[PDB]
Symmetry: C3
């Protein structure tokens, strides 16, 4: 199960059926839960917790210190949930005491080759980060978001649930839930209707989300005006409340 050419630190803690491939390093204070497969040529550093049934591929560095100059060697953490796939060359950094001391990833995420997850980022569930996506630090990615290849997210931005970014987008402000963005700099285009259909949203919730986009983006209202105008649909539709909530949480502006 554990290749004899792997190095397993004595204070690492592995569940019974964890696999580790040849020439991988599971460093000190690393915990790996049941059914997780660590590939060959993987470096894991702690303190880090990896859950169950994950898959981590060759040339990944998971749990390293951020090279960010404000980190001074504090024992910050990285927590990863269950059923995640972490592909070739992914870098995931642990947190900083200036935020939460913790980088957190949830469950069922797909993190493709050479993606980067900076210190203090928080990823929800069911997200997809396509190749070379970079979260610079303190980035929050809510459930079911899809960021296409080479998407660059600035520090402190929030990516809403079910949002989508086109290839090579450079994101410098929050992306509301469901919004599709493209370009450098990123601009809002429409809504991720395929992601709604993938999740069996009602046709009525979809039409209401279509209106909700118009309210914020196509009617010249201010954010506050838009918020009041959505208030009703938010109460009627949880789907719309998620949209409404992401815009309300965007203290530092939405992508337009």
């Amino acid at each position: 199960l554990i290749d004899p050419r792997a190095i397993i630190d004595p204070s690492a803690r592995l569940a019974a059926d964890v696999q580790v491939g040849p020439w991988s390093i599971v460093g000190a204070e690393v915990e790996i839960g049941e059914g997780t497969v660590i590939g060959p040529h993987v470096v894991l550093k702690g303190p880090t917790k990896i859950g169950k049934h994950n898959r981590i591929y060759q040339f990944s560095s998971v749990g390293e210190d951020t090279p960010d100059l404000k980190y001074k060697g504090e024992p910050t953490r990285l927590v990863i949930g269950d059923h995640n796939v972490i592909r070739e060359g992914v870098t995931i950094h642990r947190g900083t005491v200036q935020d939460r001391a913790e980088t957190t990833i949830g469950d069922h995420n797909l993190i493709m080759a050479y993606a980067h997850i900076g210190h203090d980022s928080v990823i929800g569930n069911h997200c997809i980060l396509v190749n070379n996506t970079a979260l610079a630090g303190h980035v929050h990615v809510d459930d079911w978001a899809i960021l296409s290849g080479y998407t660059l997210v600035h520090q402190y931005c929030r990516i809403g649930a079910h949002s989508f970014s086109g290839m090579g987008s450079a994101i410098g402000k929050d992306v509301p839930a469901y919004v599709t963005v493209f370009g450098n700099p990123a601009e809002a285009r429409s809504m991720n209707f395929e992601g709604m259909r993938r999740r069996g949203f009602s046709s009525e919730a979809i039409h209401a989300l279509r209106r909700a986009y118009k309210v914020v983006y196509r009617q010249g209202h201010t954010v506050e005006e838009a918020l009041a105008e959505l208030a009703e649909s938010a109460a009627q539709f949880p789907e719309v409340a998620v949209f409404r909530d992401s815009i309300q949480s965007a203290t530092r502006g939405i992508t337009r």
Copy 2:
């Protein structure tokens, strides 16, 4: 000249031809065939079913023949075919095909694929292409001969990159690039013909002028595509190069980078 470092892992079903080298801590997986004289560096992962031809060079930290990660493309067998005299630099990822399309990723001869480049599932690369650092072919991309993609060129799924074309660094390509065309930017826009390339490869003065003219006919005279094509019939019969240009345009159902 053969040297198989004993720290590498070679599957019993892998097939190695004469003069093959494999560096330490590399993995030549099941159903990988490696042709004559090919050099695999250290820290390479090869996964099959994959056929690699002769006199290739594959550098460290490359993953060649992996499955595409979206499990929505489960299926097997799917394959990878790489021809002869290719250079594959550090950290290159090349994925096999999918049963949902052609079941094969294909690379021809004499290509240079630079560090951290990505060749997505079902893509097809011809011969004498250059993919500069971190070029990313998303999937089902066809790159025709002699094309050059500068550093961090991103190509959308299903796009065709024409023979002898050129992309400036950081291009984001969402539509087909006709043969000989130069594109730049995100999103990518057409700027001119790749005259630097045409000169370096020995194109006739006569062919170069006819291509300069044909660019104008497609992009600058305000014709429709379909008109522009009809106007090119006569030049295309006289100049094989103009024919290659015309054909790339004619086979862009997707649309062309304007």
Copy 3:
């Protein structure tokens, strides 16, 4: 040992006595490593290369590899790296070509983050920061204290000026003058790196002279020639304005506007 028994150290390699080398790393022929330097696991080091003192090189890096530049033909070109540099995961640094310097050169105290690329014949000064996936195509000169943010792309032969700043995803095809901030693809000059200047302790007076100099180059409709002439005076009074002026004067590809 300090040298992991699973590493490969070439007989011709020269290592100072307290150098550390992790498992499954390669120190190639004619590679020299100075005192206090730590080489991680899974690092490929090739020569002829000289690495200095107290550097740290992380896993999956290839340092001292041949350039893929098709003009390169197997010549013993060099790579020189100074002291107190950090080279993070997956970084690629290629040696020179005989067609230019025969050497790629890096100074001291630089921070080169993951998957950055330093192309053949580049020269990096001191105290630079190259954020993740910054790519220097070749023959790129980066002067001291420059910060290139993530995914900054630098065309071959470009010069990045001292104390300049590029925004995330910048694609730089022209020279960036000293102290200038650039953003976008294609990169555009926005302002000066005032935040940079304050973090390094520049005097109010120098910052003001630099502010005025920016205007002379970017905001008065001067040709380059005319701006240079008009900066002569202030460049004579302030070393920083001279550095600025020199970066404009030495442009081979024109300057970012």
